Amino acid sequence: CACGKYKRQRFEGKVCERCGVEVTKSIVRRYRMGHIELATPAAHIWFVKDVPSKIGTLLDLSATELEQVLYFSKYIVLDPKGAILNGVPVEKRQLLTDEEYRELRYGKQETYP
């Protein structure tokens, strides 16, 4: 173990109480996976940049559209109701710019010196 409480192999398979380390072969270090939990999901690049983008393909999104949402320059809708600028109510998908979003979910304001 790390701290050094256990050796010999006599204790084969016991996780240590102090140091938290399993007592096995060291070779196990070339085979044991870890992970990292992301604060926000991230796209696997193979399923995006390999063409035809297997996800884009699945959603009816061209590579440039995909890029835009996936890398943060256009919002895509999921549930709406809104209907301004054009006057046209926009629906379940299709994307919008900052000023489009910040006019819809935030309103219309203007300050004057």
Partner 1 sequence: PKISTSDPVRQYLHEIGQVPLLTLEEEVELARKVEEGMEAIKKLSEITGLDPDLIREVVRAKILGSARVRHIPGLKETLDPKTVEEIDQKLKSLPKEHKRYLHIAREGEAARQHLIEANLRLVVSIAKKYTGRGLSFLDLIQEGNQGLIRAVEKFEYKRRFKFSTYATWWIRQAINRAIADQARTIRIPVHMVETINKLSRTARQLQQELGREPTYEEIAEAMGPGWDAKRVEETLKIAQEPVSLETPIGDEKDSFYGDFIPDEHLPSPVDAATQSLLSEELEKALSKLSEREAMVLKLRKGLIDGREHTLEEVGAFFGVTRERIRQIENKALRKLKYHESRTRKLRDFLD
Partner 2 sequence: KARVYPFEDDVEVSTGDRVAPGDVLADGGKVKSDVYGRVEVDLVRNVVRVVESYDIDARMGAEAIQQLLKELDLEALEKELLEEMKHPSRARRAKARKRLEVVRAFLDSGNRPEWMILEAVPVLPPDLRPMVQVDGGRFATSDLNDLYRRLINRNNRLKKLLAQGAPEIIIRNEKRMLQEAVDALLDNGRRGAPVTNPGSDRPLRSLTDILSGKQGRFRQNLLGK
Site of interaction with Zn ion (CB under 5 A):
1, 3, 5, 16, 18-19
Q: Do 51 and 58 meet the contact criterion of CB atoms below 8 Å apart?
A: no
Nearer to partner 2 by Cβ, of 14 and 80: the residue is 80
Told to check if 37 binds partner 1 by CB under 8 A, we report: yes
Residue 95 host element (H or E): strand 95-96
Kindly tell me which residue out of 18, 54, 93, 105 binds partner 1, with binding defined by CB under 8 A.
105
Q: How far is the CB of 7 from Zn ion (least distance, A)?
A: 10
Contact stretch for partner 2 (CB under 8 A) within 5-13, 14-22, 102-110: 102-110
Residue 73, amino acid:
S
57 binds, among partner 1, Zn ion, partner 2, none (CB under 5 to 8 A by kind): partner 2
Told to check if 88 binds partner 2 by CB under 8 A, we report: no
* 66 phi/psi in degrees, rounded to 5: -45, -55
* 106 phi/psi in degrees, rounded to 5: -125, -25
Name the nearest CA neighbour of 85 among 66, 67, 101, 73. Answer: 101
Binding site feature residues? 1, 3, 16, 19
